[PDB]
Amino acid sequence: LLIEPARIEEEELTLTILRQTGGLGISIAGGKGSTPYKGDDEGIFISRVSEEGPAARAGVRVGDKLLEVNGVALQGAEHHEAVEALRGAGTAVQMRVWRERM
């Protein structure tokens, strides 16, 4: 009958966040030794994005898996290590993220 449309299964991005006083406006969840956010994945996922915050205006979304921040790779990283990587972030934060659809 009819055909399925072209679909983007997964995606990798870079979103330059410009932290205005008050933080990035997001919450992270997961880490090596923590309860996975998706399946058994121990990555650093974005658990919230305060709308009209810095990270929202930049394109970040809930569930985006945080891979790298300003040249620092979060591969196998614990939670607090991803917390401290983002606390010395500076006024400009370039993250590499990963996503799924729906």
Partner: peptide, 8 residues
């Protein structure tokens, strides 16, 4: 058990 969450 271990459920972590941190505002930023």
């Amino acid at each position: 058990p271990h459920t972590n969450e941190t505002s930023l």
